Design a protein around this ligand. Structure first.
Ligand SMILES: *[C@@H]1O[C@H](CO)[C@@H](O)[C@H](O)[C@H]1NC(C)=O
Lengths: 23, 40
């Protein structure tokens, strides 16, 4: 699974990619 | 003595499991549990 200025933000998820692994 | 506090969310009780090739559990009592579920 491969993957700034003008008011733009990518907020974090509530559950981290690690807590997904815990559930 | 109260305050606002920040923590890592507990995803559940850390629960241990009694596995074996020869062990089992089976129940003897039960709740006829009632739930509400509500939808637009
Ligand atoms: C069941 O598990 C024990 C180890 O906990 C082992 O010694 C035993 O041989 C196993 N029995 C069978 C039928 O697999």
């Amino acid at each position: 699974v491969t993957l700034k200025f003008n008011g733009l933000t990518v907020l974090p998820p509530l559950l981290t990619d690690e807590m997904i692994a815990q559930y | 003595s109260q305050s606002i506090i920040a923590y890592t969310m507990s995803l559940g009780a850390e629960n241990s499991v009694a596995y074996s090739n020869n062990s089992i559990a089976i129940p003897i009592n039960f709740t006829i549990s009632v739930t509400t579920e509500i939808l637009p």
